[PDB]
Amino acid sequence: MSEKKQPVDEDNWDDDNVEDDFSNQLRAELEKHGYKMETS
Amino acid sequence: NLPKARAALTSARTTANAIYCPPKLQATLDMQSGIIHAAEEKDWKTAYSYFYEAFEGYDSIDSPKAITSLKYMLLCKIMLNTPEDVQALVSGKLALRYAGRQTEALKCVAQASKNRSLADFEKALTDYRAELRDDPIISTHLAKLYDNLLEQNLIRVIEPFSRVQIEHISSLIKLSKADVERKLSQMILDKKFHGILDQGEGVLIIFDEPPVDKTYEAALETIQNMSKVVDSLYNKAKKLT
Amino acid sequence: PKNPDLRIAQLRFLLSLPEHRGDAAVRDELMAAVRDNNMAPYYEALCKSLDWQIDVDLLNKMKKANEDELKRLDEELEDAEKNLGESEIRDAMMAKAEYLCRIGDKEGALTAFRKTYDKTVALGHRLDIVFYLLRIGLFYMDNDLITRNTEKAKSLIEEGGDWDRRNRLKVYQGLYCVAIRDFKQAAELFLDTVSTFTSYELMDYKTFVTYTVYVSMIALERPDLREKVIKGAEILEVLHSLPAVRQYLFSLYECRYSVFFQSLAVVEQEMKKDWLFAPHYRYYVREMRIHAYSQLLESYRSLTLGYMAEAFGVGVEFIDQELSRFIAAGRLHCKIDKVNEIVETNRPDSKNWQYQETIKKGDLLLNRVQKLSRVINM
């Protein structure tokens, strides 16, 4: 501000928003989708 | 072996001008360029012109070689179906110079190009089966034809009425779900066909409202209007501080 | 003088993800150590790969031979400068001193680059600097120097035309666009194709065909996709030599989804074993799916997942959560019914949303010129 209270108290990082969605959902993913062939 | 044929054609490129006079090379080199590139599916009408340039150099050579030479060029007119060079070639004195048996059977094959006519095409397909065997690539020639003639027949039955039931209209093409209906769906992706189907009651409904002059001419300028302000943001922030 | 060491960078990524082979990667590295006088290539590989036993005096007599070769280049600079010439003395020392950067670490790098950068009278010798920062920026993961040198190459050497080394920037900046996420400029700068032919910095051009074809299946739209390969001449013969890559392009236009779980997995296998594609292989998978799902839903307004299981063989619970996490992330908005086996398309995205971008940008933007209007007065 610098006044008042607060002074007292592409990129891959941009792509990480979509990448972190892959961390908790469906991995990447290859091996699992590759296993879906012979399952059914 | 197409890559080996191109390497054999590449060796003919430097050999053409290597010796003194070809004597006939570039005429055959353009013919060989009308084979490998024909399998490469580069361009049709231009490749058909290479068979025409080679046919001009075929004058006064072995007749058994020229009697099988018209098998490639006149069947190429069957593949294209719109060469636009029909009237030029077949009306000239050079294309009609051969009065022999096999070329007279090719004369009506060159007439079959001007024919089209599926019901007639399925007939002459058996009559010309003897000429079908000499086709260098049998798959690419007749597949693109019959697949192109498909939508040529499809646009005829769908044209008269807006919406059409898919059970009766597919009985004329002999099947529904396997390939045909998936090919009509591909025509929507290529914009050649505008419409939508119904799986429950089996009715293909054609509806279109392509033009919008209010939305497109507006939003594009507003996005440009943002570029007018962003470019002026350099003036704003700099003059103040 | 790159591909021999450029493959060592591939050996670094070869050791990175898999732990299986530490012997196979160290045998061709020692074969690359006994030549080229490589020191750092086996110094940083010594931590990643095995610690031996002993290299030392076996490779120390080579760096001693390098020291005799390094001192004769140092003797070359003061002996040749006794005479007077334009660039003849200083260019002969820098090309082999940048080769001394290929020996090891940063020693040869920083001493050659910044020293000779001033006298160079040609844009070709200035790009040899930039070219040798990109190879060491390929070896070492540092992204800093590779953004700076390309910025210096675009100002000086582009003035101005060139046939060769300016088209190499379109490959390098295209390789920078594929290193980070840029879809549009990557395939755009990769349109040069055979015009660059094959060079020591271009490695195998057939591998460059695999690099431009993987970015083309996304950024290049389906009408433009088939337009480039079909009508293309020099780019068509190189993809025809690869049966797996050519079959994928024809199948993408054929829309059959039975081979997509196969062919794309083979492409994903190449995506896993290639460098710089490790962070980027997660989004590429589903991006080709929505690219195939785009034209998919456009076919019918009412679609059944039982018909999807036909081509998928058999998608039931897989495409359930799949398409669910798509619409949730804003990818191909559609309404797909559960247990009723109905998909609804729509979405008419050309009417309501296209008017929203007007006031959307018109909020934060106009708010900036509000405070800016409050500056007057004071």
Place this chain on the structure above:
Amino acid sequence: PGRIDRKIEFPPPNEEARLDILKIHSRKMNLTRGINLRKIAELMPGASGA
């Protein structure tokens, strides 16, 4: 006959004449760097700089 002024003969195409006239007109084109401008000038006897 050089009277009265400096004597200038209308130059025929020459070796050193074809070297400079080619390098100047090549600045407006994109040309490969593996080309030798010495041999291409000698392979064109006679003719002119035009």
